[PDB]
Design a protein around this motif. Structure first.
Motif, short mmCIF file in Angstrom:
data_model
loop_
_atom_site.label_atom_id
_atom_site.label_comp_id
_atom_site.label_asym_id
_atom_site.label_seq_id
_atom_site.Cartn_x
_atom_site.Cartn_y
_atom_site.Cartn_z
N UNK B 78 -40.76 56.69 -39.27
CA UNK B 78 -40.03 55.62 -38.58
C UNK B 78 -39.36 54.66 -39.55
N UNK B 80 -38.45 55.40 -42.60
CA UNK B 80 -37.41 56.23 -43.21
C UNK B 80 -36.23 56.40 -42.26
N UNK B 81 -36.51 56.61 -40.97
CA UNK B 81 -35.43 56.73 -39.99
C UNK B 81 -34.63 55.43 -39.89
N UNK B 82 -35.31 54.29 -39.91
CA UNK B 82 -34.61 53.01 -39.84
C UNK B 82 -33.74 52.81 -41.08
N UNK C 11 -44.32 48.17 -40.29
CA UNK C 11 -43.00 48.78 -40.35
C UNK C 11 -42.08 48.01 -41.29
N UNK C 15 -40.40 49.49 -44.73
CA UNK C 15 -38.96 49.50 -44.98
C UNK C 15 -38.64 48.78 -46.28
N UNK C 18 -39.47 51.01 -49.15
CA UNK C 18 -38.43 52.00 -49.38
C UNK C 18 -37.27 51.38 -50.15
N UNK E 4 -35.29 43.87 -37.58
CA UNK E 4 -36.42 44.78 -37.47
C UNK E 4 -37.31 44.43 -36.29
N UNK E 7 -35.87 46.03 -33.17
CA UNK E 7 -36.02 47.48 -33.29
C UNK E 7 -37.45 47.92 -32.99
N UNK E 11 -38.98 50.29 -30.06
CA UNK E 11 -39.85 51.44 -30.25
C UNK E 11 -41.11 51.34 -29.39
#
Ligand code: ZN
Lengths: 383, 90, 45, 45, 14
Positions: B78, B80-82, C11, C15, C18, E4, E7, E11
């Motif tokens: 998720x 990575x998808x974002x 999340x 992110x 990354x 985020x 988003x 989800x």
């Protein structure tokens, strides 16, 4: 006085010059019928292609198939709702589409027939691929006889033309060219392309049509353009039964002046077959050799040119002039014999590569020609 | 998963490094008739050639099996998808 | 909702991780991509 | 007609293969220079 | 960072 009648010289082509031509033909183009009593007949492209196959012209020309135009590519001109309705409509569900058809001017004079989107996409793809190959410089001539339907507006399909692929071809030529000269030979005025390019300088929508009581009702000497497109709308209205000699004497000065002043880089030459003797609705009396002298003169300059089809409400004469023009594009003169083909029995009782003029009242007095040439030169010197 | 296209299956095979030959195109599939066997493509794509191709149905089944077998974890994908969604412009 | 928002912080942190990894290995990643494109070009030649 | 359309198909195939090879080479070049642009514009910040 | 939030709400709603 500017117009000056001259005797019709014999056809002459430069043997030293070599020209590359990429004929475009989609074998499925000639399989959609407008109706039982409709003048429009797409069969002419197939008959002309059969003629070019039989004459042996394939040994000196290049021919390919153009991929059909995508919906987004086809929407480069027309509105989203127009293309959406044109795709969604079928001859079997127009009861629920009556209001859309009334709004979009379709059904009564231009009716809905199955495969309409396929035909429109084929013509658009032919024009777009011709323009794209013209930009790449591989082929000097990109012949696309399938399209040329220049009567399609932005949101209305008038004059039996649902999609105007000439606009898309000119657009894809303009993506890499500053000024492209557009020449019309169809008897009807090119209302669609003219309206599309009436407010721009980057095109030269020259025309040779007839003014009178018709469906277009446009093409006056007064209309010259708006904004930066002022004096950039050359119209040469004419009258009944203009013969070969006077048509040549009108065409050659005007085109010479345009090439000397406008100086375009590419030419989008319409080659409508409804400007010939024996047409269903066309009032002209031009013969096939007169129809091809204009193309030969345009070709003699030595610049990239995109030849397209268009109108033509008869089949045999249109196919004959199209194959003759294709042969002349190769600096090769085609003999008068029409070698046997599957559709040989169509070609009249003469069975010769020629369309012969009829006796019609030549209303085109020399005074009108002089006046229109003077007006055109006056409005053209401003470029 | 035969409803997909050839490009998707080819890129799937390339990405996962599967050892399955590329699927034969629908036109390539219909090419293989009695007289169609005399063409260059069919005579060079049937026997003794490492470039042999196979029908789309079997490759679709193999890809479907590998896709259902390949388990996923939301935490790894998720974000990575974002990132990929917010990166496609660059 | 602490429990519901826990996945949100997870999340967001992933992110950001990354992005930081990319910003750390820009040089080697783009050298690899350039070499791959060059070898693709010379193979297509 | 058979000879003509056979030659037509061969010409179409040759044009298509040339066009596709040029398209692939151009796409490789475009991606290379986009990568170079991104690398140059990432160090400025 | 705020983008985020919506988003992740999308989800979890899915
Ligand atoms: Zn017409």
């Amino acid at each position: 006085m500017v117009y000056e009648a001259t005797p019709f010289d014999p056809i002459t082509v430069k043997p030293s010059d070599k020209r590359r031509v990429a004929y475009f033909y989609d074998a499925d183009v000639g399989n959609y019928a407008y109706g039982a009593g409709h003048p429009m007949k797409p069969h002419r492209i197939r008959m002309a292609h059969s003629l070019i196959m039989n004459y042996g012209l394939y040994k000196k020309m290049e021919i390919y198939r153009a991929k059909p135009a995508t919906k987004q590519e086809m929407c480069q001109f027309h509105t989203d709702e127009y293309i959406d309705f044109l795709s969604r409509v079928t001859p079997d569900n127009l009861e629920m589409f009556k209001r859309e058809s009334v709004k979009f001017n379709v059904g009564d004079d231009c009716p809905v027939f199955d495969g309409l989107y396929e035909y429109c996409s084929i013509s658009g793809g032919g024009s777009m691929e011709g323009a794209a190959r013209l930009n790449r410089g591989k082929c000097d001539v990109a012949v696309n006889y399938a399209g040329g339907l220049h009567h399609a507006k932005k949101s209305e399909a008038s004059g039996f033309c649902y999609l105007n692929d000439i606009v898309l071809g000119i657009i894809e030529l303009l993506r890499y060219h500053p000024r492209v000269l557009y020449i019309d030979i169809d008897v009807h005025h090119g209302d669609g392309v003219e309206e599309a390019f009436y407010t721009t300088d980057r095109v030269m929508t020259c025309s040779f049509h007839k003014y009178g009581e018709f469906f277009p009702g446009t093409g006056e000497l007064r209309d010259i353009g708006v904004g930066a497109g002022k004096n950039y709308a050359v119209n040469v209205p004419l009258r009944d039964g203009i013969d070969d000699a006077t048509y040549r004497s009108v065409f050659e000065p005007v085109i010479k002046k345009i090439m000397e002043w406008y100086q375009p880089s590419a030419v989008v030459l319409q080659c409508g077959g409804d400007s010939l003797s024996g047409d269903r609705l066309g009032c002209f009396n031009l013969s096939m050799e007169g129809h091809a002298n204009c193309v030969n003169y345009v070709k003699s300059f030595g610049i990239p040119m995109m030849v397209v089809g268009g109108g033509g409400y008869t089949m045999r004469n249109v196919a004959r002039t199209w194959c003759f023009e294709t042969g002349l594009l190769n600096n090769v003169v085609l003999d008068k014999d029409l070698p046997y083909n599957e559709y040989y029995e169509y070609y009249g009782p003469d069975y010769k590569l020629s369309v012969r003029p009829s006796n019609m009242f030549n209303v085109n007095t020399p005074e009108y020609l002089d006046k229109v040439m003077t007006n055109i030169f006056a409005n053209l010197e401003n470029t | 998963f035969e409803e997909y296209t050839d490009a998707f299956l080819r890129r799937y095979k390339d990405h996962f490094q599967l050892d399955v030959p590329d699927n034969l195109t629908l036109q390539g599939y219909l090419l293989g008739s009695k007289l169609g066997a005399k063409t260059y493509s069919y005579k060079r794509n049937t026997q003794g050639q490492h470039d042999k191709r196979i029908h789309k149905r079997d490759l679709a089944n193999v890809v479907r099996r590998h896709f259902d077998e390949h388990s996923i974890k939301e935490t790894d994908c998720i974000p990575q998808f974002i990132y990929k969604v917010k990166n496609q412009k660059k | 909702l602490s429990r519901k928002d826990k996945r949100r912080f997870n999340i967001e942190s992933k992110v950001n991780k990354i992005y930081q990894n990319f910003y750390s290995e820009r040089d080697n990643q783009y050298k690899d991509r350039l070499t791959a494109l060059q070898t693709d070009l010379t193979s297509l030649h | 007609e058979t000879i003509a359309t056979r030659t037509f198909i061969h010409q179409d195939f040759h044009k298509k293969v040339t066009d596709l090879r040029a398209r692939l080479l151009n796409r490789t070049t475009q991606t290379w220079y986009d990568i170079n642009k991104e690398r140059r514009d990432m160090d400025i910040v | 960072n705020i983008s985020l939030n919506e988003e992740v709400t999308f989800f979890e709603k899915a």
